[PDB]
Amino acid sequence: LGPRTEIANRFQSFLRTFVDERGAYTYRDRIRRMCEQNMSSFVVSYTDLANKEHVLAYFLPEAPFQMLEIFDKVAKDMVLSIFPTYERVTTEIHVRISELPLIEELRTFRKLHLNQLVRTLGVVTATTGVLPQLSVIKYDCVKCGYVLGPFVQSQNTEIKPGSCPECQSTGPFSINMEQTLYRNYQKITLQESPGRIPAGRIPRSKDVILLADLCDQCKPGDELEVTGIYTNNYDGSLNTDQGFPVFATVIIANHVVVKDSKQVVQSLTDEDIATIQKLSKDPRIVERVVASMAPSIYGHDYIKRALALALFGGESKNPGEKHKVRGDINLLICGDPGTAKSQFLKYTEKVAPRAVFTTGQGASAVGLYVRRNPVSREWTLEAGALVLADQGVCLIDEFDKMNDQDRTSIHEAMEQQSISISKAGIVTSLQARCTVIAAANPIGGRYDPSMTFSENVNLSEPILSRFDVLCVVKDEFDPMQDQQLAKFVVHSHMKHHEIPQDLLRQYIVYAKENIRPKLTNIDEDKIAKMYAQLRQESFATGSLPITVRHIESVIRMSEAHARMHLRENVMEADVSMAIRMMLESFIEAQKFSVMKKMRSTFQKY
Amino acid sequence: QFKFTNPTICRNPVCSNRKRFMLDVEKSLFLDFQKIRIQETQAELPRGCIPRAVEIILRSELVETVQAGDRYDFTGTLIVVPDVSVLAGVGTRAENSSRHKPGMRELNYRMAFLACSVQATTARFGGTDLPMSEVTAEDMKKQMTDAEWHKIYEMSKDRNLYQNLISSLFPSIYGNDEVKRGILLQQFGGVAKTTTEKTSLRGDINVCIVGDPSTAKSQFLKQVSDFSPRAIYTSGKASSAAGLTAAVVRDEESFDFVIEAGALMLADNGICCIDEFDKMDQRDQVAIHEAMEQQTISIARAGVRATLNARTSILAAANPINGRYDRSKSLQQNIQLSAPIMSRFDLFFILVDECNEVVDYAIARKIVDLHSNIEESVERAYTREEVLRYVTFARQFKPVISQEAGHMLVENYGHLRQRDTGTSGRSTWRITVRQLESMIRLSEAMAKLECSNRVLERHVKEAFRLLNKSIIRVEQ
Amino acid sequence: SSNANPTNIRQLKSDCVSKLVKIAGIIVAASGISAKATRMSIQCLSCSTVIPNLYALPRKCNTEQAGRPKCPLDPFFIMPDKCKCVDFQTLKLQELPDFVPQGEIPRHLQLFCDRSLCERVVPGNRVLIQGIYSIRKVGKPSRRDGREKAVVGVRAPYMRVVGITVDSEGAGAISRYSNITSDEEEHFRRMAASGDIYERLSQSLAPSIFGSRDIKKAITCMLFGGSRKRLPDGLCRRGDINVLLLGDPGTAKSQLLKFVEKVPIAVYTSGKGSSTASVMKDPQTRNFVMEGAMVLADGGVVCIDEFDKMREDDRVAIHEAMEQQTISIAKAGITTTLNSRCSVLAAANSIF
Amino acid sequence: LEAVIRISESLAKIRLQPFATDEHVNEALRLFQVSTLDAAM
DNA sequence: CGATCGAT
DNA sequence: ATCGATCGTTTTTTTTTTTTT
Ligand SMILES: Nc1ncnc2c1ncn2[C@@H]1O[C@H](COP(=O)(O)OP(=O)(O)OP(=O)(O)O)[C@@H](O)[C@H]1O
Ligand SMILES: Nc1ncnc2c1ncn2[C@@H]1O[C@H](COP(=O)(O)OP(=O)(O)OP(=O)(O)O)[C@@H](O)[C@H]1O
Ligand SMILES: Nc1ncnc2c1ncn2[C@@H]1O[C@H](COP(=O)(O)OP(=O)(O)O)[C@@H](O)[C@H]1O
C-alpha cells in the first residue's frame, strides 16, 4: 500500500542511515560480515531500532510473523542485488533480535501472551536428536502421469487445487522422495533452574522448538536466554470433551542466546578494541595481572600469580600418535579449616568462560551406565562433569573429607585426559580435557608446624603420583599487618550506596584460543641440574614422589608466562620465573630446617 | 461449550453443514484453568472409609495460589461432567429415536467438582502496610509501614526500651539476661549494604545455645515457630537427610530421579532451627559446614545443575558428655567436636546449672503466676503488635558505618587480638575474621535497634564487651 | 570410489540429501542378515510385479473371467515360488573421536545394504565410505503424525551404501580380509629371514621412552599368541597369554597401554566397569536377546589397569573366562556357553 | 610351565621357524626370572 | 457401522 | 429429493536384568 510499502523502506533507510560506532554503521557492514562467513543469521537491535524509529513496537505484536518476513525479504533484495555473486549457495535469509527489556521466568505466562513477542529462559533437559522435515508441497499425477506441480504451502494445512498439467484433473495422485525442499530440525525440553523455584516443590516445564538453522548448539544442562514466541497447537483434540481441553503450549525460537557462550564472542568497537595494544606490551604487565585475580586479600601474591598463569596456560603439542600431553594442571593449597579459601574460587568462575558448581561430597564418582532402550523412555545418560565441561572448569569445594571411592575415580582424567567406561549396553569412551579446582581441608586441627607434610593429611600411595602448585596458608601473628589489612577490610566495608574485569576476560579468551606458543633450545640443560637438586637434597626427608609431571609443569609455567605476554617463545626469563616460584614453595613445605634449596640457590639466585 | 463441536449448520447461506471453515486463535474468546486434587478434611477425621477425594478446578484469578497444606472455602458448583467414555456402567441406555413417518455414544457419566471462591485461611500473614489490631492512621513512607510512628518513635527513643523489650517477650520465663538480649539480634537485621559485584555479602549471624539439662532451652524456641514468619522449626532427625535433601527416589514416576528440595532448604529468610546437634550423624553436619557460610550449595548423583542456597541463621542445642559441666577435661574434650564450626559460631552463651534454693523457689514463684488463671503471667512494657511492627520497620533504613570506632574498630579489634594474643598456652584457642564480620553486623544491628542509620561507637563498645563475654565464656 | 575428502556427521543435513558424499567414522555393531527381493508374481494376475523403488495393489480382480461374478476388493495371493531374493544387513556408523564430541557426546547413524556388502564389515573398524543420504517416509500437511507427534513433517534419516571401502590408518582396515600382495609377503618373510628383528622390535614402542628394556623383551611377545593346542579330550590347553605389572607411578603405564591398544584389535577401559554378561529384552516384540564385550576380543587382546580399584562383584566371571575361554550363561531361559579367545594385560597400584 | 610354553610359542611365532629349541627359550628363562626374583623377597 | 454416490 | 447399493471398517501384553546408594 502507500503505508504498507513503507515497512521495507524503513528497514532499507534504517540499515544504512541509523549509524553509530562513530560512523560506518554495523548494518551497513554487519550484513556483509554475515555474508562473508556464510551464516545467514543476521541479528537486529531493538534498542537501536527504537533509537531510530519507535513505531515498530506496536506494529509487531499484531503479527510479528509478518514483521520478520517483511524484514528478511529486505535482506534478500539488498544482498542479491548488491551481492548477486551470492546467488548460488544458500540465497535465503532470516533475522534475529537480542534486546527485549524483560525476563519472564517460567510459571509466568498465560493466555494473554498468545502468539506475540516473548522472552524467557530455563534449563535444557533431554530432547530429540537431529532430524529434518519438509518445506514444499509437490506430488505426482498418475491418471495422466504428470506432476501435480509445486503448490503454495500453509503452516500445517492442505491445498489441493484442481489446477495441474493433467487437464487440471487427476484428483488422485502419488508422491516422490526428491525434487522437494528440506529443512533440519531439533527439539528441546526446557526446565527451570534450581535457584529460582518457588522454594521447595516440583517445578514446571514447557517444550520449545528450534529449527533448521538452530541445532547442535544446545545440550542437556546448558545456559540460555531466548526470545521465542508463544505457540498454540490449535487443536489437541476438541470434541465432546474432558472436563478440560487437552491443549498444550510450546515456544518457537527466533533468537536463542547462550548465557555461558564459551567461544570467541564479542563484536569490535571501532577503536576501543586495541584496548589490548595500547598497553598490553609493557614490561610492568608481569604483575598487573595479579591486581585483578580476586580483589580481596592484602597478602598472598603467590597463589594469586599461580592461578593467574594457570587460568589461561595450556598446550596440546600432540606428538605423532603417542598421546595428548596436557591442557591440564592440579594446583593445590592445603591450608587451614577456615582461612578464606572457598571465596578465592568464585571470581575464577565469574570471569572464566566455562564451569559448573559442585562442592565436596559429590556422587560416588559414577554420576547420575545406562543401557540404551526405548524402555523407561531412554534411561537418561551422562558420566560425570569433566565429560560435561572439557577445556574449562567445574568446581569443587572442601574435598578432603569425601568418599575415598571418588579420590579413586577422578584419578586418571587429570592426566591421561581420557575417559573409558563399560558396564552397560555400551563400552564407548569420551574426552576429558580439563584441569581441576582444589579447595580441600587439612587434618590435625588447623595446621602443623614445619614438621613434615605427609603427616599433615593422609592420602594413599597411588594418588601421591601427581601434584602441582604447592602453596599453604600457614599463619602466625603480626600486629602491624593486622592493622593494615583491617583498615583494608573496614574500607571494604565502607562502599555503601588498575584493570577492570571489563576487559581481561577477552584477553584470555584471545590468549588461550588463538595464539599457540612454542619453545626453543635456550638453556634446557639447567632443568636437569635442578631436578638433581631435588633428588640429592631431597631423598627421604621431604621428597614425596614428585615424579615427571611437575617437572613438565615447569614447561607449563614457561608457556603460561609467554602467553601472558603473547610471546610464543622466550629467553631465560619465563623459565627462571618458574624456578623462582618453585624455589620459594619447596622451602615453604619443609621443617624448621627450612632453607635447603635456599642455601643451594643463592648461587642460582 | 465443554463438549466442543466444530460442526455447525449455517448462518447466512444454504451451504455446507458438516464441512467447516478453518479456525480462529486470533480475535476470539479464550481463558485458563488448572486441576488439582483434595483429600478428606482433617477437621473431620472419622474411622473406616478412606479419605474420599474430590476433583477441583480453578478459574483465572484463583490460580497458583493454592498450595499443599492448606484449607479452603469453595463454591458449591457440583457438576454434570461432560465426560466421554467409561466402563462398569451397565445400566439402561437411551437416546432419541425420532418420529417415524411414511451420533451414538455410550452414556455413563462420572463426577468431579468445580469452585469459584477461595479463602486459603491459616496461610495468611501480611507484612507492615496491613493495618493491624493496633494502628495509627497516619502518613508515612508507605500505607501502614510505620504510620504508628506516633508510638514507634517512642519505642525507638527510650534508653530504657532496650531492657524493657528484653523483658517484653520473656514474661513467662526467667534465666540469664544475655541471651534475652542477644537472641533478638538473630531475629533483628544485620548489615544490608549497597555495594559491589564482589560476591554476596551476608546479613545474618550464627547463634547457639548450650546448657545443662532441664533448663528450658527448648522452650526458648518451642514458641519461636509460633512467633516469626518464614521461620518454622522441627528437628533434624524429625526427618531423614531428606530434611536437607528431598526423599531420594529410584523408581519411575515422572523422570525416575528427583532430589530438588528439602526441609532446611525452604526456610528462605526465616530460621528453621533444630535441636540435638551432638549425636546427629556427620552428613548434614558437613553439609552445614559450608551451607551456613557459603550459602550457595550443590550436589551430584541426581543434579539438575544443582545450585541451592541457605538464607538464614540457626539455633543450637548442645549438651556435654557426662550431662554435667564437670571441670575434668578441656572443652575440646568436654564436647568432642571440631574447631572451625566452634569459630563459625561467633556467639555461644552457655546456660550453666547450679543448686541454690532461692533460685528454684523463685521459679516456683514464677509459677505463682502461671496458673492463677486470672493473672497467670507477669507485667510487660510493650504489646506484641507494636513490637513486631517496629521490627518489620527497622530494617528498611540502610544502616551505615562512618564512625571513628568504625575507623578504630581496628583499635578495639587490635585489643581483641592483643588480649587474645595469648589463648595459646593453656588449652589454645583460635581467632579469625569471621569474628570481625560477626562483630560488624552485630554492632550494626545494635544500632538498627535505634531506628537510626549511621553506626555509633557505643555499639562497637557493647559489641566488644559481648565478644569478650563469649570468648572468656569459652575459657575452661 | 574416490579420494575426494571425508566429511563429518555434524553436517549431514537437509541440503546433503539424496546426494553422494564421503565420510569416515567407526563401527559399533550391526544387524543380522534378514532378507529382501525385487519382484514376484501373484496368482491373481500371474505377472512378475515390477517396481521402481528399493505397494499400492489396486482394486480390480484379474480373476474376472468368472462371468459377471468377479472378485473385487484386493484379492492378492503372493506367489513366492515366483519371487526373488537379495540380502539386507543394516550396517551402522559412529562419528569420529575429534569432530565435535568436545562439549558434547558423539551421535551415530544406521545403514543398509542389498547384495554383497554383507559379510563385508565386522564392527569396531574404521571406514571410508561413499553412500547417500535419504529417507523412508514422507509428508508435510496437517495429517500430523501419531498421538502428539510431528508438529509438521519430521521423517527419519538413514543412508544406504553405494560403495563403502575401508581405511588405511597405516593399515586402517587390515583385520580379516587379504588384499595384500606377494611383495608384502616377501617383505614379511625376508624380515623374518632377518636375524636382527627382535631387538629392533624391542625399540618399537619406546621411541620417546627410555629404559625398561629387559622389561620390554616380552611386552610384545604377548601380542602374537602361541598355540591353541587342543586335544581329542577336553584338555584345550590355554592358548592366549597374560601379563602383570605394578609399581610406583610416574613410570608411564597409561601411555604404554594406550600404545598397545594402538599397535589389530583391542579395547581399553579400566575399573568401575569391556564387560554378568548382558541379557536384555528386545523393545521390539519383547524377546530376551543377548548382546552379552570380551566377545570383541575373540582373538584380539585386552589391557587394563584398575584391577585393584574396582570391587569384586565384577571380577569373577573374568577371574574364570581367562582359564577356559568359555563365557558361560545360565540366567534366563538360555544355556549358551559362549566363548572367545582374549588375553589381558594387568597393571595395578600397590597401596604402600 | 603351561605359560612359559606359550612364551616359546610366541618366539617361534615371530621368527616363523616351527620347531623351537631351548636356546631360543633361554630368553624366556631370563625373562620370567624377573618374576621369580621379584617374588623371591 | 459408517459415509459416498447413483439414479428415480 | 428420495431411496438404496456403493464404498471401507479391526485391536492385546507384565515382568526380568543390571544399576546405584
Ligand atoms: N582478605 C579477605 N577479604 C575478605 N574476606 C576475608 C579475607 N580473609 C578472610 N576473609 C573471610 O574469612 C572467611 C572464610 O570463610 P570462607 O567462606 O572462605 O570458608 P573457607 O574459609 O573456605 O572455610 P572451609 O574451606 O574450611 O570451609 C570468609 O567469610 C572471608 O570473607
Ligand atoms: N621414563 C619416562 N620417559 C618418558 N616419559 C615419561 C616417563 N615416565 C613418565 N613419562 C610421562 O609421564 C606421564 C605419566 O603418566 P601415566 O598416566 O603413565 O602415569 P603412570 O605412570 O601410569 O602412573 P599411574 O600408574 O599411577 O597412573 C606420561 O604422559 C609419560 O609420557
Ligand atoms: N526459667 C524458666 N522458665 C520457664 N520454664 C522453665 C524455666 N526453667 C526451667 N523450666 C522448665 O524446665 C523444663 C526444662 O526441660 P528442657 O530443658 O526442655 O529439657 P531438655 O533439658 O531435655 O531440653 C521445661 O519444661 C521448663 O518448663
DSSP string, C270-316: -S-----------TTT---------TT-SSS---B--STTS-STTSH
Q: Are A15 and A28 in contact (CB under 8 A)?
A: yes
Q: In which residue are the cell numbers 505426482 written?
A: A140
Q: Are D28 and D4 in contact (CB under 8 A)?
A: yes
Burial class (CB in 10 A: 0-12, 13-18, 19+), C131: buried
Q: Going by C-beta distance under 8 Å and a sequence separation of 6 or more, which residues neighbour residue A526?
A: A575
Q: Are C278 and C263 in contact (CB under 8 A)?
A: no
Q: How far apart are CA C84 and CA C37, in angstroms?
A: 5
Q: Tell me which residue of C90, C143, C140, C109 sits closest to C24, measured CA to CA.
A: C109
Q: Report the nearest atom of ligand 3 relative to the CA of B219.
A: 18
Ligand 2 pocket test, pick from A316, A318, A326, A415 with the greatest ligand atom count within 8 Å of Cβ, gives A415
The one-letter code for the residue type at B418 is: Q
Please state whether strand F lies within 7 Å of residue A366 at its CB atom.
Answer: yes
Strand, helix or coil for residue A213: coil
Strand, helix or coil for residue A172: coil
Q: Tell me which residue of A309, A362, A293 sits closest to A565, measured CA to CA.
A: A309
CA dihedral B125, B131, B132, B137 (to 10 degrees): 160
Are β-strands C92-94 and C108-110 bridged in parallel, bridged antiparallel, or unpaired?
antiparallel
Q: In which residue are the cell numbers 541451592 written?
A: B308
Q: Are B91 and B52 in contact (CB under 8 A)?
A: no
Q: Tell me which residue of A265, A232, A269 sits closest to A247, measured CA to CA.
A: A232
Q: How far apart are CA C260 and CA A322, in angstroms?
A: 11
Q: Are A312 and A348 in contact (CB under 8 A)?
A: no
Burial class (CB in 10 A: 0-12, 13-18, 19+), B36: exposed
Q: Are B417 and B471 in contact (CB under 8 A)?
A: no
Verify whether the Cβ–Cβ distance D7 to C217 is below 8 Å: no
Q: Per-residue DSSP letters for C25-79?
A: -B---------B-S--EETTT------S------S--S---SSS----S----EE
Q: Are C279 and C290 in contact (CB under 8 A)?
A: yes
**Does B touch C (3+ CB pairs < 8 Å)?**
no
The one-letter code for the residue type at A9 is: N
Return the ligand number nearest the Cα of A347: 1
Query: Residue A197 has which C-alpha cell?
Result: 523455584
Strand, helix or coil for residue A315: strand
Burial B272-298 (b: 16+ CB within 10 A, else e): bbbbebeeeeeebebbbbbbbbbebbb
If you count them, how many residues does chain C have?
Answer: 352
Strand, helix or coil for residue C347: strand
Q: Report resolution (Å) to 1 decimal.
A: 4.0
The one-letter code for the residue type at A345 is: L
Experiment type: cryo-EM
Are β-strands A470-471 and A332-333 bridged in parallel, bridged antiparallel, or unpaired?
parallel
Burial class (CB in 10 A: 0-12, 13-18, 19+), A101: exposed
Q: Are A49 and A56 in contact (CB under 8 A)?
A: yes
Please state whether strand F lies within 7 Å of residue C194 at its CB atom.
Answer: no
User: How many Cβ contacts (< 8 angstroms) between chains A and B?
Assistant: 182
Write out the H or E segment, with its range, that includes residue A44.
strand A43-44
Are β-strands B350-351 and C41-42 bridged in parallel, bridged antiparallel, or unpaired?
unpaired
Query: Residue A325 has which C-alpha cell?
Result: 600431553
β-partners of residue A139 are A149
Q: How far apart are CA C112 and CA C134, in angstroms?
A: 11
C-beta A297 within 6 A of ligand 1: yes
Verify whether the Cβ–Cβ distance C314 to A369 is below 8 Å: no
The one-letter code for the residue type at B136 is: T
Q: How far apart are CA C200 and CA C210, in angstroms?
A: 15
Instruction: Centre a 10 Å sphere on the Cβ of residue A134 and count the other Cβ atoms it contains.
Output: 21
Residue D32 is classified by DSSP as H
Closest residue (CA to C1') to nucleotide E2 in the complex:
B103
* B280 φ/ψ angles, rounded to the nearest 5 degrees: -70, 145
Strand, helix or coil for residue D11: helix
Q: How far apart are CA B81 and CA B111, in angstroms?
A: 6
Instruction: Centre a 10 Å sphere on the Cβ of residue A360 and count the other Cβ atoms it contains.
Output: 20
Q: Per-residue DSSP letters for B401-418?
A: ---HHHHSHHHHHHHHHH
How far from D22 is each of C214, D5, D35, CA to CA, in Å? 19, 11, 20
Strand, helix or coil for residue C223: helix
Q: Where are the beta strands (DSSP E) in A421-514?
A: 470-471
Query: Residue A173 has which C-alpha cell?
Result: 495422485
Strand, helix or coil for residue B74: coil
Could you tell me where the DSSP H helices lie in C158-293? 182-193, 198-201, 213-216, 221-224, 253-262
Output the CA angle C70-C73-C78, nearest 5 degrees.
95
The one-letter code for the residue type at C260 is: V
Ligand 3 pocket test, pick from B172, B174, B215, B223 with the greatest ligand atom count within 8 Å of Cβ, gives B215
Query: Residue B262 has which C-alpha cell?
Result: 528439602
Output the CA angle C137-C139-C144, nearest 5 degrees.
110
Q: How many helices (H) and strands (E) does chain B have?
A: 14, 6
Verify whether the Cβ–Cβ distance B252 to A490 is below 8 Å: no
Query: Residue C108 has which C-alpha cell?
Result: 551415530
Q: How far apart are CA A75 and CA A68, in angstroms?
A: 11
Burial class (CB in 10 A: 0-12, 13-18, 19+), A424: middle
Query: Residue A507 has which C-alpha cell?
Result: 584477553
Is D7 in CB contact (< 8 Å) with chain C? yes
Q: Tell me which residue of B247, B243, B245, B224 sits closest to B235, measured CA to CA.
A: B243
Output the CA angle C219-C350-C205, nearest 5 degrees.
20
**What Rg do the C-alpha atoms of chain A give, in angstroms?**
31
Q: Tell me which residue of C310, C311, C340 sits closest to C324, measured CA to CA.
A: C340
Verify whether the Cβ–Cβ distance A221 to B304 is below 8 Å: yes
Residue of C nearest to D30 (CA): C214
User: Nucleotides of chain F within 7 Å of a protein C-beta?
Assistant: 7-8, 13-14, 16-21
Residue C17 is classified by DSSP as -
Separation of CA A193 from chain center: 17
Q: How far apart are CA B154 and CA C104, in angstroms?
A: 65
Write out the H or E segment, with its range, that includes residue B224.
helix B224-227
Burial class (CB in 10 A: 0-12, 13-18, 19+), C100: middle
Residue B17 is classified by DSSP as S
Q: Going by C-beta distance under 8 Å and a sequence separation of 6 or more, which residues neighbour residue D10?
A: C218, C221, C222, C224, C225, C226, C241
Please state whether strand F lies within 7 Å of residue C278 at its CB atom.
Answer: yes
Are β-strands A205-211 and A137-139 bridged in parallel, bridged antiparallel, or unpaired?
unpaired
Q: Tell me which residue of B119, B141, B112, B117 sits closest to B128, measured CA to CA.
A: B141
Strand, helix or coil for residue A381: coil
Write out the H or E segment, with its range, that includes residue D6.
helix D4-15
* B210 φ/ψ angles, rounded to the nearest 5 degrees: -135, 150
Q: Tell me which residue of B234, B231, B256, B182 sits closest to B445, measured CA to CA.
A: B182
Q: Of D6, D14, D16, which has the smallest distance from its Cβ to C198's Cβ?
A: D14
Q: Per-residue DSSP letters for B112-130?
A: -EE------TT-----SSS
Q: How far apart are CA A605 and CA B276, in angstroms?
A: 58
Are β-strands B54-58 and B34-38 bridged in parallel, bridged antiparallel, or unpaired?
antiparallel
Q: Per-residue DSSP letters for B272-312?
A: ---S--SSS-TTHHHHHHHHTTS--B---SS-SS--B---S
Are β-strands C242-246 and C344-348 bridged in parallel, bridged antiparallel, or unpaired?
parallel
CA dihedral B135, B138, B143, B144 (to 10 degrees): -20
Q: In which residue are the cell numbers 500437511 written?
A: C141
Question: B148-474: CATH homologous superfamily?
Answer: P-loop containing nucleotide triphosphate hydrolases (3.40.50.300)
